[PDB]
Design a protein around this ligand. Structure first.
Ligand SMILES: CCCCCCCC/C=C\CCCCCCCC(=O)OC[C@H](O)CO
Ligand SMILES: CCCCCCCC/C=C\CCCCCCCC(=O)OC[C@H](O)CO
Ligand SMILES: CCCCCCCC/C=C\CCCCCCCC(=O)OC[C@H](O)CO
Ligand SMILES: *C\C=C(C)/C=C/C=C(C)/C=C/C1=C(C)CCCC1(C)C
Ligand SMILES: CCCCCCCC/C=C\CCCCCCCC(=O)O
Ligand SMILES: CCCCCCCC/C=C\CCCCCCCC(=O)O
Ligand SMILES: CCCCCCCC/C=C\CCCCCCCC(=O)O
Ligand SMILES: CCCCCCCC/C=C\CCCCCCCC(=O)O
Ligand SMILES: [Cl-]
Length: 262
């Protein structure tokens, strides 16, 4: 009852559209999990953990979209021509707790294909995960108030975006200082991966703000549409490119399974 979803009745079309976005989301992630599984054999040992983390992200994200889709259909019932709330079982908080695990996985695979290792891998990962967790936690607290205190949503949103800015400055500094280490021509590819990250990750703040500029049932639909665009791009497309870089660098490094697959 702390999220705006609880404030509205939905038409069958709005409800069915939301249910379809979530179920379609589950399908995409599990279908890509198999891709990442099958291509791990074509990735050198040095980079294989990068594709394994993609598998982890797929299942983690797929289970939570699956969970949301079922919570969505348990929470509402078609009564008198509309879908009305029946039980307190749907909430976007589940997305936030899940980012605590999936965002580190997405960051760690980027550092691995950057060829960071040892001391600098450990320290860089620690500061990035610490900052990402401060982004998520302050964001989590803030969205508890999207119904009751929109001013406090904005202030937690401002504290969260400060970690977001610092976190991306670390990522960008590491990519642009290490892109000359990369092989197979992937110095060019990693930069686009960074701009794709910038685009897809920034959609989550927009969805976070929907309650402020569109607190209605159509805003609920839009927010889930934006999560779905962002999920597919920050997890699946991003994963495909990370796996591409991993196999190309494997091939340029003398890994024959990688050379034959390409
Ligand atoms: C009373 C209210 C309390 C407010 C508290 C202030 C808000 C904290 C925000 C930023 C601090 C973190 C910024 C400094 C951390 C930099 C990370 C770093 O040094 O690592 C970079 C390096 O590239 C890796 O190898
Ligand atoms: C509460 C509101 C806070 C206001 C927030 C507005 C300020 C954001 C500014 C820039 C975006 C951050 C960009 C971070 C990623 C790019 C930086 C980078 O890559 O730096 C390269 C390095 O300098 C070369 O080696
Ligand atoms: C609706 C189902 C969606 C499910 C999604 C299924 C995932 C595969 C999709 C596109 C692959 C084309 C992009 C190519 C990715 C490049 C990575 C690479 O290195 O290619 C591996 C090659 O196949 C080794 O022989
Ligand atoms: C599933 C993958 C990712 C990378 C999810 C990323 C989410 C964010 C970058 C969220 C950022 C937020 C900010 C910057 C401030 C408002 C609260 C948010 C947590 C949504
Ligand atoms: C304080 C909370 C965060 C704790 C630190 C988390 C960062 C973990 C550091 C990196 C772990 C990566 C290990 C993978 C090594 C790859 C093996 C290989 O080269 O094949
Ligand atoms: C340890 C990692 C967490 C980093 C900083 C947490 C900041 C405060 C979050 C709690 C808000 C109440
Ligand atoms: C790390 C967290 C950084 C600072 C958080 C400051 C915002 C806390 C104020 C919440 C508003 C309130 O308690 O009434
Ligand atoms: C997620 C990104 C956050 C961006 C920072 C937001 C900056 C704050 C913007 C202007 C604040 C205006 C004050 C509005 C008061 C709202 C309380 C009310 O409803 O009366
Ligand atoms: Cl997730």
């Amino acid at each position: 009852m702390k999220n705006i979803e609880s404030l509205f009745d939905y038409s069958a079309g709005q409800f069915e559209f939301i249910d379809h976005l979530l179920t379609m989301g589950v399908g995409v992630h599990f279908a890509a999990l198999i891709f990442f599984l099958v291509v791990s054999q074509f990735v050198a040992p040095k980079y294989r953990i990068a594709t394994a983390l993609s598998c982890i992200v797929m299942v983690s994200a797929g289970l939570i979209l699956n969970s949301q889709a079922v919570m969505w259909t348990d929470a509402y019932a078609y009564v008198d021509g509309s879908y009305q709330l029946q039980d307190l079982t749907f909430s976007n908080g589940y997305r936030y707790v899940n980012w605590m695990a999936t965002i580190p996985c997405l960051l760690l695979q980027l550092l691995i294909v950057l060829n960071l290792k040892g001391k600098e891998l450990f320290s860089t990962a620690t500061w990035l995960i610490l900052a990402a967790w401060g982004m998520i936690i302050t964001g989590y607290v803030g969205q508890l108030y999207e119904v009751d205190d929109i001013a406090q949503l904005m202030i937690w949103g401002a504290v969260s975006t400060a970690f977001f800015v610092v976190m991306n400055w670390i990522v960008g500094t590491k990519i642009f200082k290490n892109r000359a280490t990369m092989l197979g021509g992937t110095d060019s590819t990693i930069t686009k991966v960074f701009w794709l990250m910038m685009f897809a990750w920034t959609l989550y703040p927009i969805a976070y703000l929907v309650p402020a500029f569109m607190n209605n049932a159509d805003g609920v639909v839009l927010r889930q549409l934006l999560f779905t665009i962002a999920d597919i791009s920050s997890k699946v497309i991003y994963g495909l490119m990370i796996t591409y870089i991993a196999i190309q660098q494997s091939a340029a490094a003398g890994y024959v399974p990688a050379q034959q697959a390409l």
